[PDB]
Amino acid sequence: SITENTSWNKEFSAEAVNGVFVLCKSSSKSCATNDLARASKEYLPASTFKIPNAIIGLETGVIKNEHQVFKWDGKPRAMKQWERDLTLRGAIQVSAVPVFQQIAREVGEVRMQKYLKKFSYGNQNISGGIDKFWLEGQLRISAVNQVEFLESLYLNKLSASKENQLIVKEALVTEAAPEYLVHSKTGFSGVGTESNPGVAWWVGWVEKETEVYFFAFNMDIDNESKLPLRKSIPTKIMESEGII
Amino acid sequence: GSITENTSWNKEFSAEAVNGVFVLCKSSSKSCATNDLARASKEYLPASTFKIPNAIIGLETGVIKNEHQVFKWDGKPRAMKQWERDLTLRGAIQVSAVPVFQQIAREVGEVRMQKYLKKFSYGNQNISGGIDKFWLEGQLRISAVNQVEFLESLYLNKLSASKENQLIVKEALVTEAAPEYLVHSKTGFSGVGTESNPGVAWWVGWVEKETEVYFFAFNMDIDNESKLPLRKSIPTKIMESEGII
Ligand SMILES: [Ca+2]
Ligand SMILES: [Ca+2]
Ligand SMILES: [Ca+2]
Description:
Two copies of one chain form a homodimer.
Chain A: E1 2-4, H1 9-13, E2 19-25, E3 31-33, H2 36-39, E4 42-43, H3 50-59, H4 88-93, H5 97-107, H6 109-118, H7 133-136, E5 141-142, H8 143-154, H9 162-171, E6 173-176, E7 180-188, E8 192-193, E9 196-208, E10 211-221, H10 229-240
Parallel strand pairs in A: 1-3
Antiparallel strand pairs in A: 2-3, 2-10, 4-5, 6-7, 7-9, 8-9, 9-10
C-alpha cells in the first residue's frame, strides 16, 4: 500500500528536481510518497547495491568476516579515497567501487543471480559484466523495492545468517544520536547522457524511540553539483515529520 | 600486549583540576598508553558501564528476547523522567535506564551472573551486595585496563557468548558515526560520593578509524555532577590531539 502525499513536492519543485521519496513507518506495508508512479519505477541502483553485495559476499565466504581488511594493491583507483586499505564499513562508507567489483567477481554470476532472486532485488538482471551490472548494466530497482529490502534486512529476514545481516547493518550506520540511529547508503550512477539523466540515491532506515522508519529517495541528475540534494531534500522531509 | 606511561596527558587533567586516568590502546600494535599506570590498574565501581556485560548476559540467558525487544514502561515513576517511556535495548543503554537492567539482573540470577563475569574475567568478579545493585553500590570493581581488555574481546567477538549477541550489543553501543570512523561507547557514574570518598565517573569504548581500532577507558573522581561532562571532554580532547576522532 502506497499513499501519495502532496505536502512533499514542495521540497522538489523548490529545487527544480524530478525525483521521489518513499517513507514508511513501522513497516513497508504502509508507505507515503510524493509520486505514486515514480515510487515504483525501477532505476539503476548504483552504489546502493553495495548493501546486497556485502551480504552476499559474507554469505558466500568471499568476505571472511566483519574484520576482513581489503588491501589496496597500490594500483590507481578512480577516487583517491579508495587508494588505501579498507574495512567493510570503510569500503561501504567511501563507496569503494573496486573493492565491491572484486567481491562481485569472486561471488560469480551463478551465486549472484541466486541471491538477487532470494532477496527479490528489483528486476534481478545482472547481465552486462559481473563487475559492473549495478553501475552500467540492466539491473533496476524501485524506491519501494528498496524499502522492502531494507525492512527484511532490519528484521533479519533475508536469506542469510543473522550474523551477516547484523554485520552489514552496523556497517551502514551513518548517524548516531541519543534518541535515534540512522542506517543508510548513498548512490550515484553518473550524469547520464543527453535526454537520459543519471540517478542519485539515498536509502536506509531510522530507528527512533521504539519506532522504525524505512526510506528511499532517488532523483534524476545531470550535474554532479546537484548531488547534495539527494540528502538535503529527504532530510528536510524527515525533519518536518519529526523523525530526525 | 604492552602499556606505556605518558604523563603529558595529565595536562588535560590539571587544566580541569581533575584526578583521573585515560587508557588508550592501538589494536594493530596491541600497545596501550596512559597518563597514570597506577590509577590505570585501580579498580572502581563500574556503575552503568556494567550495562555492557549485563546486556550480553541478558541476551545469552534468554532474559532479553532479541535486539528488537521493547522494554515497556509500567507507568510507575522512575528516578529520571528520561526512563519513563518504552525503550529498546539501545534506548535503555543510551539513557542508562537502571530499573530496566535491575529487572534483567534479577531474572538472570546470582549463579549465572557470577558464571558469566567469571567467563568474562570482569574485574574482581564480586557481585555481592544485592543482585540488582552490586555494580551500583555493591562490591564489584574493575580497572581501566581490565575494561579495554573486556571491550577488545567484545569487539573481536571473543567473549563467551554467541557472536550474534555480541554483535547486537555492539551496535547498541554506537554513539558517533562518521564516514572515516565509528565510535562505540558507554558512560558511567556512581554518584557524588562522600567526604574524602568522591564518586567515580566513566567513559569507555572503542573507535574504528581507517583499518585501525582504538580501545579506550577513562575514569575520574567526582564530587559534583557539574563536572560530569568532563568524562567525555577530557578523553575526547586527548583522542583529538592524537588525530583519532
Ligand atoms: Ca540498528
Ligand atoms: Ca555517491
Ligand atoms: Ca563496530
